[PDB]
Amino acid sequence: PSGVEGAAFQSRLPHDRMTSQEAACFPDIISGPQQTQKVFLFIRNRTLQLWLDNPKIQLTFEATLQQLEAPYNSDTVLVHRVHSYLERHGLINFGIYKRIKPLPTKKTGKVIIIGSGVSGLAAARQLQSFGMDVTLLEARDRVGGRVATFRKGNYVADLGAMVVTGLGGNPMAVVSKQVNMELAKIKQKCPLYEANGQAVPKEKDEMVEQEFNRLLEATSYLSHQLDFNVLNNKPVSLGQALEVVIQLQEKHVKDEQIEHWKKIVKTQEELKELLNKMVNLKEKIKELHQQYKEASEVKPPRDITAEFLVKSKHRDLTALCKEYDELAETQGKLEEKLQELEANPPSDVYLSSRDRQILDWHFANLEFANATPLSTLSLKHWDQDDDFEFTGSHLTVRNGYSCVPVALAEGLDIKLNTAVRQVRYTASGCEVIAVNTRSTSQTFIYKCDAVLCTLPLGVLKQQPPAVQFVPPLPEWKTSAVQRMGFGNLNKVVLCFDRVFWDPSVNLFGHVGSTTASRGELFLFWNLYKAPILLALVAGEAAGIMENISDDVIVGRCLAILKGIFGSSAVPQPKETVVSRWRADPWARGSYSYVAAGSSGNDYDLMAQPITPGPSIPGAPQPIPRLFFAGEHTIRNYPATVHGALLSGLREAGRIADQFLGAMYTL
Amino acid sequence: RKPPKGMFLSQEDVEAVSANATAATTVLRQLDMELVSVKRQIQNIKQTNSALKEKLDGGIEPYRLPEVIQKCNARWTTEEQLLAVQAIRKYGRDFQAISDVIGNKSVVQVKNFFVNYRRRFNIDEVLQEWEAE
Numbered sequence A: 001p002s003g004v005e006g007a008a009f010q011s012r013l014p015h016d017r018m019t020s021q022e023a024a025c026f027p028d029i030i031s032g033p034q035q036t037q038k039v040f041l042f043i044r045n046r047t048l049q050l051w052l053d054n055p056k057i058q059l060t061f062e063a064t065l066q067q068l069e070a071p072y073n074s075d076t077v078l079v080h081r082v083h084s085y086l087e088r089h090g091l092i093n094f095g096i097y098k099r100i101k102p103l104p105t106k107k108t109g110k111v112i113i114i115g116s117g118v119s120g121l122a123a124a125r126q127l128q129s130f131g132m133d134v135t136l137l138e139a140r141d142r143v144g145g146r147v148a149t150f151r152k153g154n155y156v157a158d159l160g161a162m163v164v165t166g167l168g169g170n171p172m173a174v175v176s177k178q179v180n181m182e183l184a185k186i187k188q189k190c191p192l193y194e195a196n197g198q199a200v201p202k203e204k205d206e207m208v209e210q211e212f213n214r215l216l217e218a219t220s221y222l223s224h225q226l227d228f229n230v231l232n233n234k235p236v237s238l239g240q241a242l243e244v245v246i247q248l249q250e251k252h253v254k255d256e257q258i259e260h261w262k263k264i265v266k267t268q269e270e271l272k273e274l275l276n277k278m279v280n281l282k283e284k285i286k287e288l289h290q291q292y293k294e295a296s297e298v299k300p301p302r303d304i305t306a307e308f309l310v311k312s313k314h315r316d317l318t319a320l321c322k323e324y325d326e327l328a329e330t331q332g333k334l335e336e337k338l339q340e341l342e343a344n345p346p347s348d349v350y351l352s353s354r355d356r357q358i359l360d361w362h363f364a365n366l367e368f369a370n371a372t373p374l375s376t377l378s379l380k381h382w383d384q385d386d387d388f389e390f391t392g393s394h395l396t397v398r399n400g401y402s403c404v405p406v407a408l409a410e411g412l413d414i415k416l417n418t419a420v421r422q423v424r425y426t427a428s429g430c431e432v433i434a435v436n437t438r439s440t441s442q443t444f445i446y447k448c449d450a451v452l453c454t455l456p457l458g459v460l461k462q463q464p465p466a467v468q469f470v471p472p473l474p475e476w477k478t479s480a481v482q483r484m485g486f487g488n489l490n491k492v493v494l495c496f497d498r499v500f501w502d503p504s505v506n507l508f509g510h511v512g513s514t515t516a517s518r519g520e521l522f523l524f525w526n527l528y529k530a531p532i533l534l535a536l537v538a539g540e541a542a543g544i545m546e547n548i549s550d551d552v553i554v555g556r557c558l559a560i561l562k563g564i565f566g567s568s569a570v571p572q573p574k575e576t577v578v579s580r581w582r583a584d585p586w587a588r589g590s591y592s593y594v595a596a597g598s599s600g601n602d603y604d605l606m607a608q609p610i611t612p613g614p615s616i617p618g619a620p621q622p623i624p625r626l627f628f629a630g631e632h633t634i635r636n637y638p639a640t641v642h643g644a645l646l647s648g649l650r651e652a653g654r655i656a657d658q659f660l661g662a663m664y665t666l
Numbered sequence B: 001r002k003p004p005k006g007m008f009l010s011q012e013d014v015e016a017v018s019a020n021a022t023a024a025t026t027v028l029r030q031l032d033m034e035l036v037s038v039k040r041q042i043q044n045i046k047q048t049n050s051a052l053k054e055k056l057d058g059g060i061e062p063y064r065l066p067e068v069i070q071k072c073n074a075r076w077t078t079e080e081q082l083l084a085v086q087a088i089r090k091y092g093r094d095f096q097a098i099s100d101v102i103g104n105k106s107v108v109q110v111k112n113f114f115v116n117y118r119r120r121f122n123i124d125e126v127l128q129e130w131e132a133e
């Protein structure tokens, strides 16, 4: 899409239609005549365009109104009112841009932000941009959260986020223009290799894959067309549904061999009953011929009864012979339409053990995608976010994805090695109690008007709590925290002194021996300039490989690599790193997933801010003081960097709306 | 509205595989045993029918008789008249057999014979005795 309509698309907005967001700020426009709506819609898209076309400088309201043309620029309050909407909700002037008007000398309000992951930093950027006083508290000794980038010599490898899922409507597209990022397209081709060490032949590779996709489509049919979504009071998972689908295909192979062999027995019996009748006919012929012979022995000249007896037996014998010849014709057909059936048997198996193992790899790929075993994904909702997929090739960041957090952090007040232990929120303000990770006795108190919490969902889940809320979070919030899923996947970074793999292939698979280890070292990435291979640990494997030492893990990688390229080809790695995200106490996992029994509507519960009770009974209801952001708070883009970033932009909007008021709603 | 093609997913089927924990493994074991059940019933009749198939070795070639190429004639000699009356006593109204017995009389003339010599050969009682068997 191109033009002003392209800017609406690249901003995840319908170009010809006002959103629920915009109805809330412009209820005059959307309740009004169809014509003002199109004027508004053009002003939005035009301003979106102007920003997108050059996101390295601030887009001021003056600069906007100048490039606008009549009759669209006739009304300035509408243009000022649209531009301010866009700026507030981070649709324009977000990220890293030169500021035309430098920030105000005095700040209004003070916000404490917990965590400097990408969601934390993006809000911090916006809030500081809006003239607020902002401090971030980070438990780690580095920004980025789950954007971690290993660096040593020329060796650069992401241990966390690795891919940009397509620039079609992706806010990271804007950020990539702003920060020097080497965005390198992946090449989709992925050769599988069985545990023996040899490629799956192309013909086999396509019928398992297409069955895999056929099996997914099947589960969707059970979900939406058969309402197969509860089972002994429990919600049905995706893994359950795949089993039930495979079983029913196994069933149907058996029902259909039974039906085919049942055909053969019916035909053989027809022929049994027919050979019986031809044996019996051959013996009536046997004695009736005898009888005619003995009647020809009486020599002529005979009395007419004795001549009748010859003529009679002869007619009778031919009649039986005619009847026996008809059965031989019929017999031939039945013997021929029996070689046809026995020659067209239906398939003996639904999937062979080799076939089923290759499919297990495609399941390990889903387990990697959602970072959890398919037995935990909600059948009904696990893919509830597919409609918002971006367009275009997936890419990698060949200079390391940490370059983005590090860039966002430039300019902000970040206290590193600062672990929050308690959050206290009252009708009159908030205080956050943190300690020093290096020496825990040292204690810090931070007072503020609002706390933005970007604690990973796994941290929020921790029993007993790593962070205590005073007063405790309400049941509606804590239940969303139990119900949701927080998954796990890990990486092994392999650092070599020479390329020994196909350099024109970015990724290649390794088929597992068992179902139970389908995720154990199942995939390898050739992503970087230097010779680094990178090996995924998905599914149930992820949780279990965390209890095994690095050398045991690197050893199994070397064995698999030796199998694919020969023992001589694979040298010992110069450097090795193995992630352990579930063990990490500032993650407690990798990213979130729609658990069976959860829904995308828990993600909205995660995002509602908390409003404390009044200090004095009878005092008027207070302002909200506790705000949540991060990957698990954005329904339409969970578990990604872009989704984290979008949620930081989102809270900064609603915090500023709350503590600086929003003039653009009049 | 409908599954992918070849996928077999009926409502009646999905209960039957979910009803309990191993209700999947049971009903796929009833088909494996229902399939062995039929495959040896195959070999059993495939082997009964091998025995019957061998009692017919040689067919009926030895018991066959040569064809009689005989030009059909019109006039009724006493010998053919006598043969006729006897065939009627053995075949009732099956004119084709009677035409094959005499060998020189067409089915019509056999039928015609039924009327021309109906009185003189007492065909009424001849046919009435045929029916007494």
Ligand SMILES: COC(=O)c1cccc([C@@H]2C[C@@H](O)N3c4cc(C)c(C)cc4N(C[C@H](O)[C@H](O)[C@H](O)COP(=O)(O)OP(=O)(O)OC[C@H]4O[C@@H](n5cnc6c(N)ncnc65)[C@H](O)[C@@H]4O)C4=NC(=O)NC(=O)[C@@]423)c1
Residues within 6 Å of the ligand: A114, A115, A116, A117, A118, A119, A120, A137, A138, A139, A140, A143, A144, A145, A146, A147, A159, A160, A161, A162, A163, A164, A165, A369, A370, A385, A418, A419, A420, A421, A454, A455, A456, A459, A466, A467, A489, A490, A491, A581, A585, A586, A587, A589, A590, A591, A629, A630, A631, A632, A638, A639, A640, A641, A642, A644
């Ligand atoms: C349906 O679609 C898909 O599922 C999807 C689609 C496409 C791609 C991807 C992939 C999967 C993977 O291949 N990759 C990836 C890999 C790994 C291993 C991991 C781990 C993550 C990814 N992410 C996710 C991305 O990493 C994150 O979701 C994002 O980073 C979230 O950030 P955040 O919410 O801000 O949070 P934080 O945790 O970063 O920050 C919190 C801060 O709190 C600090 N603190 C904690 N406790 C305290 C305390 N007590 N006191 C003070 N500070 C504290 C902590 O120290 C930290 O500083 C991927 N996303 C991608 O897009 N690309 C990828 O490449 C992908 C998946």
